[PDB]
Symmetry: D2
Subunit: 27 residues, 4 copies
């Protein structure tokens, strides 16, 4: 595995998850 590779991608997962989650909460 490559830890720095997956940190960067999981950070994108987190940001995208949060964006859509917050969108769900304000409709």
């Amino acid at each position: 595995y490559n830890i720095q590779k997956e940190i960067d991608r999981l950070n994108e997962v987190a940001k995208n998850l949060n964006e859509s989650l917050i969108d769900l909460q304000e409709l």
Copy 2:
């Protein structure tokens, strides 16, 4: 669906993702 039930779970998804990401970042 029940939007609150899914928001609750997705909140927990986000929290657990965040703590996994932090753990990875401190290696």
Copy 3:
């Protein structure tokens, strides 16, 4: 080394998938 983080992320993925399916099928 990172089995515990893998295990945790697996449960994250399962719960995310279940929410996705529940939003479309319930």
Copy 4:
């Protein structure tokens, strides 16, 4: 009301998370 945009985006989030899981268990 219409959550199609969040469903589409969370599907991509899930795909990226799933590939991270696969890649973390590689090698």
